[PDB]
RNA sequence: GGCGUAAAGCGCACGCAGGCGGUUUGUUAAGUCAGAUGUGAAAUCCCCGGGCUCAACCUGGGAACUGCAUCUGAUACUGGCAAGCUUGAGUCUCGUAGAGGGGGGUAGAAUUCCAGGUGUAGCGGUGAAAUGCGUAGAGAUCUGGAGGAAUACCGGUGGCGAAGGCGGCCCCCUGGACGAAGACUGACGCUCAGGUGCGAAAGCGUGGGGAGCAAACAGGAUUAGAUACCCUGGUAGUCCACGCCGUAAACGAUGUCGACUUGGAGGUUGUGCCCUUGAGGCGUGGCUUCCGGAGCUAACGCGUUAAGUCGACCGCCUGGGGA
């Protein structure tokens, strides 16, 4: 992605001065209007290397677990992440979703038992709460876990947007070994990430850019 | 008050090397720039300048390696309240060796290897590693 | 205190000039001017401990001054004490 | 090794002796360092051997006696000496904020009291009462006067001071703090056992003063009792002058000074800049409150006002009770 093609989206935009974390000095531009600027000359090159390794990871087989949870970009994620045939969290994570992957694998289990028997097993014959009461439980299990019901294993790594809302799977990873790829805005802590990716981490157009990228740069990986 | 320059030094090396400082700067003066030379030739900072001439200021530039501080630990010895001497065949070393003492010796400031290869004891200035 | 045009004055008397503002002799006649007109002010005012202590200062500060220039050169201190009616 | 909450920071400050002391040059060579020489009794200890059948034991030689002294050198650091240096510390100028201290004036609110007008049977007090006060007219209301004590609103994690502590207004005498600019002195500095001074309240002595409050004391109640808690009174005291006392959970339960180490929001008080063009915009000092980062911590928590990282000096602790 392009220094000119970041600016655009409002990729430099940040948080304001108040809610900075202060490890975060180098890859502020500066500020204006009590808002912090980002520096793009820093974005851009760290961002080239995060597709890098993103994509030499994909040339492996690797799985990527898409992460971003926002209310308002939770969709774009999705699409993001399907759109290179991997898997995503789009809605609140589970805490031990890696870490207690086992117990939380069983979950799984149950969300495929559940689409499987309401479709090929079909039942439709229910007794009139069922219908509801087992989509409900059904329902609820596709927005926690209908990304990553096929992921299998544990993830070769994650793409997190903003690492401050996604604070818990970032430290499973590191927990995990699992390298850690994240857009960082100002107020949020970069010590958890690997590679850090330094710009707005809300707006949807920014979140795009980058989520559109890493699922662009997954399928040349992946074409090779 | 300011009564002892050097761990005054070893202070700030230290503070701003927890700090993840590129550099510490302080008043200068032949004592320090002879521990900085030590330092900057055993490999534990980078380099050092002092700049001025009526108010010199001695500039230390620190030194990383794994996302960490070459300087492990530093610690004054020898002090105004406590004076330590030592003699060739009792020069103390440091980590078995891996780290160094500095020495202040007739032949000048230098390492407890480099005293003891040259048969001289000394006033037991800090320890580095 | 003592007043700018009071101070002025003995700048001039026991300075190498006008300018002279800190030179050990001057600050010494400044303390001794501040300390004998202060002499009237405790002798109607006992209770007043709060500015004595502040009179104390002026003296504990005097003495270090003398011993300094009677170390350094103990000539100069003589004069300065005859001078000034101290020590007796 | 410790001293915020576990034992432990003197209630606070000044300061002699003492300890420590910024930076440059030269000098000295006491400290320190090197070498040489002498001495460090033997035995013992230790090492390798030898002798008693082995072992204990005896024994040869060594090593060790880490120490002292003399001489000769080395001169980086410490000390002495001499000249300095200006950043520490002072002095000077002009301003700012402040319940900082001492003295003298003065003000309006209220209580109690005294003297009257109106008025008439209650007031007061409590959980409920009673003691108490009122027809010698209370209480209530209006008016005039005496006296003492304290200063509503302003008023605020506001301000000042070393601590104790300091609050109506005005003047006089006076201490400290901070800012701006530049000049002057030239390490004059930090700490401080002993010493000296300050030091809430209560208490003490003499003489004043005395409205309100109130130990003691008396009376009414409560209660099984009630030497209390509640009520009606009320003396010392609380107030002034001059002396004494020298103690408090005298507390931040955190000694003083200096250097260094990420941040956010405020309060207070200087000062430089900007169409002052708005009650602002950008900086830069002093003090202060609330969060919080690393680090620290037994935890609680502390966290640039440290309980973090260091140095100088002081005070203090060494299981509970006894004390
Ligand atoms: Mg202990
Ligand atoms: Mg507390
Ligand atoms: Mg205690
Ligand atoms: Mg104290
Ligand atoms: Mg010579
Ligand atoms: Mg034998
Ligand atoms: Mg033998
Ligand atoms: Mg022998
Ligand atoms: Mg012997
Ligand atoms: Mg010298
Ligand atoms: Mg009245
Ligand atoms: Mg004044
Ligand atoms: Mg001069
Ligand atoms: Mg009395
Ligand atoms: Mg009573
Ligand atoms: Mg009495
Ligand atoms: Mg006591
Ligand atoms: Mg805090
Ligand atoms: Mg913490
Ligand atoms: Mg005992
Ligand atoms: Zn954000």
Request: aromatic share 6%.
């Amino acid at each position: 992605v392009s220094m000119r093609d970041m600016l655009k989206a409002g990729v430099h935009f940040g948080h304001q001065t108040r809610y900075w974390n202060p490890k975060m000095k180098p890859f502020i531009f500066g500020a204006r209007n009590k808002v912090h600027i980002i520096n793009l000359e820093k974005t851009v090159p760290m961002f080239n290397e995060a597709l890098a390794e993103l994509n030499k990871i994909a040339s492996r087989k690797g799985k990527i677990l898409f992460v971003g949870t926002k209310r308002a970009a939770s969709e774009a994620v999705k699409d993001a992440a399907l759109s290179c045939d991997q898997f995503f969290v789009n809605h609140r994570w589970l805490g031990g979703m890696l870490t207690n992957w086992k117990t939380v694998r069983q979950s799984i289990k149950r969300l495929k038992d559940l689409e499987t028997q309401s479709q090929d097993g079909t039942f439709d014959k229910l007794t009139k709460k069922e219908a509801l009461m087992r989509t409900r439980e059904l329902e609820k299990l596709e927005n926690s876990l209908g990304g990553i019901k096929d992921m299998g294993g544990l993830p070769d790594a994650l793409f997190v947007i903003d690492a401050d809302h996604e604070h818990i799977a970032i430290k499973e990873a590191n927990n995990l070994g699992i390298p850690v790829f994240a857009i960082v805005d100002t107020n949020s802590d970069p010590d958890g990430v690997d590679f850090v990716i330094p710009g707005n981490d809300d707006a949807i157009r920014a979140v795009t850019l980058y989520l559109g990228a890493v699922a662009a740069t997954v399928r040349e990986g992946r074409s090779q | 008050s300011m009564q002892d320059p050097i761990a005054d030094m070893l202070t700030r090396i230290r503070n701003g090397q927890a700090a993840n400082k590129a550099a510490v700067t302080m008043p200068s003066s032949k004592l320090k720039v002879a521990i900085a030379n030590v330092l900057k030739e055993e490999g534990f900072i980078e380099d050092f300048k002092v700049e001025g001439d009526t108010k010199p200021e001695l500039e230390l530039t620190l030194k990383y390696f794994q996302g960490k501080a070459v300087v492990e630990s530093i610690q004054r010895v020898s002090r105004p309240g406590l004076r330590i001497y030592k003699r060739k065949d009792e020069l103390p070393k440091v980590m078995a060796g891996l780290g160094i003492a500095v020495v202040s010796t007739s032949k000048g400031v230098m390492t407890d290897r480099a005293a003891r290869q040259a048969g001289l004891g000394g006033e037991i200035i800090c320890y580095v590693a | 205190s003592l007043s700018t045009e009071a101070t002025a004055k003995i700048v001039s008397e026991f300075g190498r000039d006008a300018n002279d503002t800190g030179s050990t002799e001057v600050q010494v006649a400044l303390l001794t001017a501040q300390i004998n007109h202060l002499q009237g002010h405790f002798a109607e005012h006992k209770k007043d401990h709060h500015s004595r202590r502040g009179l104390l200062r002026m003296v504990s500060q005097r003495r270090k001054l003398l011993d300094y220039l009677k170390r350094k050169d103990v000539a100069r201190y003589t004069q300065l004490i005859e001078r000034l009616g101290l020590r007796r």
